[PDB]
Design a protein around this ligand. Structure first.
Ligand SMILES: NC(=[NH2+])NCCC[C@H](N)C(=O)O
Length: 690
């Protein structure tokens, strides 16, 4: 809706912008509201030291009649020299703030008291704090000279590239940027392009793109936009709820630039920005939180009003963007504290509602047509006796059974959040384990054996006539942490870091590289699809169990150069380790698998008990956590009346005229014994197709 032509005719005559009376103009426009003919004539001949006029400031609002505010400050002096205009605009926008009152700034993180609100990521999805800042000694963005914009870049980059620790990173200037860098920054949502029709008419687009640039730390949790709408747009953000950490990281960086360079700042306005809407703190603090039940709640609006925050909706059903509505009259510390307390109060509403509905027996389980293992063993008696206990990591019975409740068509419907779940909720888990893993009894206990030399497997089909492929997978979880459904944000990131650290140290047969899912370009994605190495987000069963939290943060893929060794990280289990080969050499596949699994084990360790073997969030993956597969062509021995008599002696099953043959048992036998059985069974099947 930009009409630059019409405005230019009024600007060149230094005449009152008549378009501000054209019915299409925004009724709520502040420049329309407060730029009266008497204001205009009183100021139309005034100019700042930098040459900024009244028309320069108001121009964007006349070009873009749909403007909410409609004015931009060319410099600091513009706020005072055109005071009769800016004051009325500021006190309208920032109501009930009064310029006479004064503003107080506070960038000391220690003043904020904010223990991590939602480490388990049950409700809060992401946290983001933005500040706008302008350097001492220069004009603001609409009025900065060509040389000054460059000098600002030079000084800012000098400070930013000296940043240490988690703030260390790289600067990417827009001028000279190549296509690969441009795409990387687009994929990370870090890029900004030429200003819209609002920045254009404000004169902010001058000399594009000279002096513009992007800085970001290696973690990609800190972002700086240089010379966009203001000199500095500084952003601290991350998934999860730790706003205390976010504000701490922001202030460490901001105060460093402050001490070395200095910001434009007054008592009246706080920190000076191009648009008056960004005065004071220059801050936008935001949190994304799934809060469906609290919205319905009668005290919802009162909490927002109390803490001066607002809620806007944006997969993300029930998810709201909570953010501050004030920038003047409160400090940065105060803005974050209201933000913290406000979210906390909102989260407590959502928690109360969920607690109430989780207080009673899942009535939906009373339907006789629900044939899940959950319904079979979860009597109201058992439910009542367990419903109020929680593990050391905050896992409850309802957390464990939630997927089976939400998904009535589950076969099992029960997941474990941590190791303690298998003991604390043993009345439920024991019966489910022994049912699915029948005839195994927990008292028998389980023996793990990852010694490949204890397997006697001379190659069956070296010709490659019958057995096309052989594949052995094991599911594993890293010791010292919760299981996948109960992982906190920092646990999942720790698991990725340490596992990646181990896999990179692998040599010989197992040397390879790691592809994280976060920030993966389309080229890598495609070539992983070709090899069938790429995994996607979990289904509705895993979603309801809490497995898909913060996707895809902390998820990644590793494979060796020979395409014979694959590791999925933080998918369904923390570690899904697969050995693959062409042909029939099971002993070679298992040997390679053992070499890698044993090394990861020594350096990191696995979650393991005598009664369950290796622990998984999914009770189906206990014991060996192993699926051994043989893709074999058997048209004839599939018919010999000794198929059952062999497929049952060696506990194997057949599907897939090529047939996939897999082990049926995971619990009660060792990995060695399981592999040996698959061998012994396929051998006799091959002693019939021979
Ligand atoms: N590969 C392993 N991490 N094995 C662990 C064996 C001991 C285990 N902590 C248990 O008592 O059951």
């Amino acid at each position: 809706m930009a009409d630059p032509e019409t405005a230019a005719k009024f600007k060149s005559k230094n005449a009152f912008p008549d378009p501000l009376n054209d019915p299409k103009c925004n009724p709520k426009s502040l420049v329309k509201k407060y730029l009266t003919p008497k204001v205009f004539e009183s100021l139309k001949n005034k100019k700042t030291k930098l040459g900024i006029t009244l028309w320069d400031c108001i121009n964007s609002g006349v070009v873009n009649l749909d403007s909410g505010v409609g004015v931009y400050a060319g410099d600091e002096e513009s706020y005072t020299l055109f005071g009769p205009l800016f004051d009325a605009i500021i006190e309208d926008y920032h109501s009930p703030y009064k310029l006479a009152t004064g503003h107080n700034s506070d960038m000391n993180p220690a003043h904020v008291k904010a223990p991590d609100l939602d480490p388990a990521n049950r409700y809060i999805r992401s946290t983001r704090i933005r500040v706008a800042r302008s350097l001492k000694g220069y004009g603001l963005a609409p009025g900065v000279t060509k040389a000054h914009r460059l000098e600002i870049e030079k000084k800012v980059v000098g400070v930013l590239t000296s940043l240490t620790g988690d703030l260390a990173g790289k600067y990417y200037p827009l001028s000279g940027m190549d296509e690969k860098t441009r795409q990387q920054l687009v994929d990370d949502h870090f890029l900004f392009k030429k200003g819209d029709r609002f920045l254009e008419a404000a004169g902010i687009n001058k000399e594009w793109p000279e002096g513009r640039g992007i800085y970001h730390n290696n973690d990609k949790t800190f972002l700086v936009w240089l010379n966009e709408e203001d000199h500095l747009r500084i952003i601290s953000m991350e998934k999860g709820s730790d706003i205390g950490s976010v504000f701490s990281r922001l202030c460490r960086a901001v105060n460093e630039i402050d001490k070395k360079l200095g910001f434009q700042h007054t008592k009246k306005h706080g920190y000076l920005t191009s648009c008056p809407s960004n005065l004071g703190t220059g801050m936008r603090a935001s949190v994304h939180v799934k809060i469906p039940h609290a919205k319905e709640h009668p005290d919802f609006e009162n909490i927002l009003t109390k803490y001066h925050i607002q809620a806007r909706g944006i997969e993300d059903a029930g998810v709201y963007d909570i953010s501050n509505r004030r920038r003047l009259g409160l400090s940065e510390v105060q803005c974050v504290q209201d933000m913290y307390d406000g979210v906390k109060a909102l989260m407590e509403l959502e928690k109360e509602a969920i607690a109430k509905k989780r207080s009673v027996f899942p009535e939906v389980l009373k339907n006789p047509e629900v044939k899940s293992l959950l319904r079979k063993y979860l009597t109201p008696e058992l439910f009542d006796s367990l419903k109020d206990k929680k593990t050391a990591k905050g896992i409850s019975l309802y957390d464990c059974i939630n997927s089976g409740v939400e998904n009535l068509d589950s076969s099992c419907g029960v997941y474990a959040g941590d190791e303690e779940c298998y003991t604390l909720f043993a009345p439920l888990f024991d019966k489910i384990v022994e049912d699915y893993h029948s005839p195994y009894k927990l008292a028998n206990k389980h023996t793990s054996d990852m010694n490949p030399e204890k397997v006697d497997a001379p190659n069956l089909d070296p010709e490659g006539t019958y057995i096309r492929s052989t594949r052995i997978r094991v599911a594993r979880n890293v010791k010292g942490y919760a299981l996948t459904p109960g992982l906190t944000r920092n646990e999942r990131l720790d698991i990725e870091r340490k596992v990646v650290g181990v896999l990179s140290s692998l040599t010989g047969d197992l040397a390879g590289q790691y592809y994280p899912l976060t920030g993966m370009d389309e080229a890598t994605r495609q070539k992983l699809v070709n090899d069938h190495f790429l995994f996607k987000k979990g289904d509705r069963f895993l979603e309801a169990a809490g497995v898909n939290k913060l996707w895809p943060e902390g998820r990644g893929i590793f494979h060796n150069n020979d395409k014979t060794f694959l590791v999925w990280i933080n998918e369904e289990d923390q570690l899904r380790i697969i050995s693959m080969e062409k042909g029939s050499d099971i002993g070679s596949v298992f040997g390679r698998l053992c070499r890698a699994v044993n090394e990861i084990d020594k350096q990191l360790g696995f979650q393991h008990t005598d009664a369950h073997g290796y622990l998984s969030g999914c009770p189906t993956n206990l014991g060996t956590g192993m699926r051994a597969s043989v893709h074999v062509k058997i048209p004839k021995a599939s018919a010999h009346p000794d198929f059952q008599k062999i497929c049952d002696e060696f506990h194997i099953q057949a599907r897939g005229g090529v047939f996939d043959i897999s082990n049926r048992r995971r619990l009660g036998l060792s990995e060695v014994q399981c592999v040996q059985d698959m061998y012994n069974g396929v051998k006799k099947l091959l002693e019939i197709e021979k």
